[PDB]
Scaffold this motif. Structure first.
Motif, PDB file in Angstrom:
ATOM      1  N   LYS A 141       0.842  -1.227   0.000  1.00 28.32           N
ATOM      2  CA  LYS A 141       0.000   0.000   0.000  1.00 28.32           C
ATOM      3  C   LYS A 141       0.869   1.266   0.000  1.00 28.32           C
ATOM      4  N   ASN A 142       2.077   1.228   0.577  1.00 30.22           N
ATOM      5  CA  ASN A 142       2.837   2.452   0.958  1.00 30.22           C
ATOM      6  C   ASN A 142       4.199   2.554   0.257  1.00 30.22           C
ATOM      7  N   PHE A 143       4.862   1.440  -0.071  1.00 34.66           N
ATOM      8  CA  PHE A 143       6.208   1.450  -0.705  1.00 34.66           C
ATOM      9  C   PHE A 143       6.127   2.114  -2.084  1.00 34.66           C
ATOM     10  N   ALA A 144       7.117   2.957  -2.392  1.00 33.21           N
ATOM     11  CA  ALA A 144       7.326   3.600  -3.709  1.00 33.21           C
ATOM     12  C   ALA A 144       8.828   3.791  -3.938  1.00 33.21           C
ATOM     13  N   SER A 145       9.316   3.434  -5.130  1.00 36.91           N
ATOM     14  CA  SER A 145      10.717   3.658  -5.570  1.00 36.91           C
ATOM     15  C   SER A 145      10.735   4.155  -7.020  1.00 36.91           C
ATOM     16  N   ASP A 146      11.409   5.283  -7.270  1.00 35.42           N
ATOM     17  CA  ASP A 146      11.677   5.823  -8.631  1.00 35.42           C
ATOM     18  C   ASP A 146      13.047   5.321  -9.107  1.00 35.42           C
ATOM     19  N   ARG A 147      13.716   4.485  -8.303  1.00 31.07           N
ATOM     20  CA  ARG A 147      14.999   3.808  -8.637  1.00 31.07           C
ATOM     21  C   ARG A 147      16.125   4.842  -8.800  1.00 31.07           C
ATOM     22  N   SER A 148      15.920   6.083  -8.339  1.00 25.73           N
ATOM     23  CA  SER A 148      16.878   7.212  -8.499  1.00 25.73           C
ATOM     24  C   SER A 148      18.182   6.913  -7.745  1.00 25.73           C
ATOM     25  N   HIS A 149      18.125   6.064  -6.714  1.00 20.44           N
ATOM     26  CA  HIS A 149      19.301   5.588  -5.935  1.00 20.44           C
ATOM     27  C   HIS A 149      20.198   4.675  -6.786  1.00 20.44           C
ATOM     28  N   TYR A 164       9.799  -3.680 -15.610  1.00 20.76           N
ATOM     29  CA  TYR A 164       8.410  -3.174 -15.429  1.00 20.76           C
ATOM     30  C   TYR A 164       8.469  -1.760 -14.857  1.00 20.76           C
ATOM     31  N   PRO A 165       7.382  -0.960 -14.978  1.00 24.24           N
ATOM     32  CA  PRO A 165       7.396   0.430 -14.523  1.00 24.24           C
ATOM     33  C   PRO A 165       7.586   0.550 -13.003  1.00 24.24           C
ATOM     34  N   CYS A 166       8.230   1.638 -12.570  1.00 20.19           N
ATOM     35  CA  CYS A 166       8.499   1.974 -11.147  1.00 20.19           C
ATOM     36  C   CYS A 166       7.222   1.829 -10.313  1.00 20.19           C
ATOM     37  N   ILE A 167       7.351   1.254  -9.115  1.00 19.09           N
ATOM     38  CA  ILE A 167       6.259   1.156  -8.104  1.00 19.09           C
ATOM     39  C   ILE A 167       6.065   2.553  -7.504  1.00 19.09           C
ATOM     40  N   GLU A 168       4.833   3.063  -7.529  1.00 22.16           N
ATOM     41  CA  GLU A 168       4.457   4.361  -6.912  1.00 22.16           C
ATOM     42  C   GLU A 168       3.062   4.225  -6.298  1.00 22.16           C
ATOM     43  N   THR A 169       2.728   5.115  -5.364  1.00 22.10           N
ATOM     44  CA  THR A 169       1.399   5.201  -4.704  1.00 22.10           C
ATOM     45  C   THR A 169       0.794   6.570  -5.026  1.00 22.10           C
ATOM     46  N   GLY A 170      -0.404   6.849  -4.509  1.00 24.51           N
ATOM     47  CA  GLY A 170      -1.016   8.190  -4.549  1.00 24.51           C
ATOM     48  C   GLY A 170      -0.202   9.193  -3.745  1.00 24.51           C
ATOM     49  N   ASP A 171       0.424   8.735  -2.654  1.00 20.37           N
ATOM     50  CA  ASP A 171       1.059   9.591  -1.616  1.00 20.37           C
ATOM     51  C   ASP A 171       2.502   9.952  -1.991  1.00 20.37           C
ATOM     52  N   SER A 172       3.216   9.094  -2.729  1.00 19.67           N
ATOM     53  CA  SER A 172       4.675   9.241  -2.979  1.00 19.67           C
ATOM     54  C   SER A 172       5.118   8.463  -4.224  1.00 19.67           C
ATOM     55  N   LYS A 173       6.205   8.926  -4.853  1.00 19.15           N
ATOM     56  CA  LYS A 173       6.902   8.254  -5.982  1.00 19.15           C
ATOM     57  C   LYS A 173       8.261   7.709  -5.512  1.00 19.15           C
TER      58      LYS A 173
END
Length: 203
Positions: A141-149, A164-173
């Motif tokens: 529900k909460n994890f998000a990574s833009d893989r910028s690290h 596959y595309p980056c995991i994101e939520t409504g709250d954070s990328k």
């Protein structure tokens, strides 16, 4: 002779596909574990609430893990952090799902702690492990990574990204550092010492 015990344990059916059948990218274990949780959610075998994402790290982001596929031998891999999936079966027996381990997939909790983690007593203090344990439901529900690290200053990949595309939520990328952090004043779930971790989920 000694009684080492788990009826639900002995006939345990894995919550995952076979190791070779799972979505996997080297050095993206946080996403590898996320995909295992998504599979468990979409399949009607186990409740998601029996499952946990476990982030292993410390203040200095240098943690030894033994029985790693990256370095097949006696000596350990030193990670900045590592993520595995923990399934506590309804009977109370715990299993570890680590796509990067040479141990079985899945592996009995006590066996993974015994061979992969080991004790923090004889370990140089700066290398000691802390564990952030997040509900699989909460993690999804909460994890998000833009893989910028995982991309250098030039914007090139340190390791090839998951396909596959980056995991994101409504709250954070991007909130990965809130999971990597072993500061209990930060992020979701609970932060445990090695002894707290082994005691809570161990046989």
């Amino acid at each position: 002779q000694a009684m080492e015990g788990g009826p639900a344990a002995v006939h345990y059916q894995p919550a995952s596909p076979p190791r070779d059948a799972c979505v996997y990218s080297s050095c993206y274990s946080e996403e590898n574990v996320w995909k295992l949780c998504e599979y468990i959610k979409n399949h009607d075998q186990y409740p998601l609430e029996e499952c946990y994402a476990v982030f292993i790290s410390n203040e200095r982001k240098m943690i030894p893990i033994w029985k790693q596929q990256a370095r097949p031998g006696d000596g350990p891999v030193i990670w900045d952090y590592h993520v595995v999936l923990l399934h506590v079966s309804s009977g109370g027996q715990s299993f570890i799902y680590d796509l990067d381990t040479v141990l079985p997939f899945p592996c009995l909790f006590d066996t993974y702690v015994e061979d992969a983690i080991k004790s923090d007593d004889d370990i140089h203090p700066q290398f000691r492990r802390k564990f952030r344990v997040i509900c699989a439901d909460s993690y999804l529900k909460n994890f998000a990574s833009d893989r910028s690290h995982m991309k250098d200053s030039s914007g090139n990949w340190r390791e090839p990204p998951p396909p596959y595309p980056c995991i994101e939520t409504g709250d954070s990328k991007m909130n990965l550092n809130d999971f990597i952090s072993m500061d209990p004043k930060v992020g979701w779930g609970a932060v445990y010492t090695l002894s707290e971790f082994t005691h809570r989920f161990g046989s």
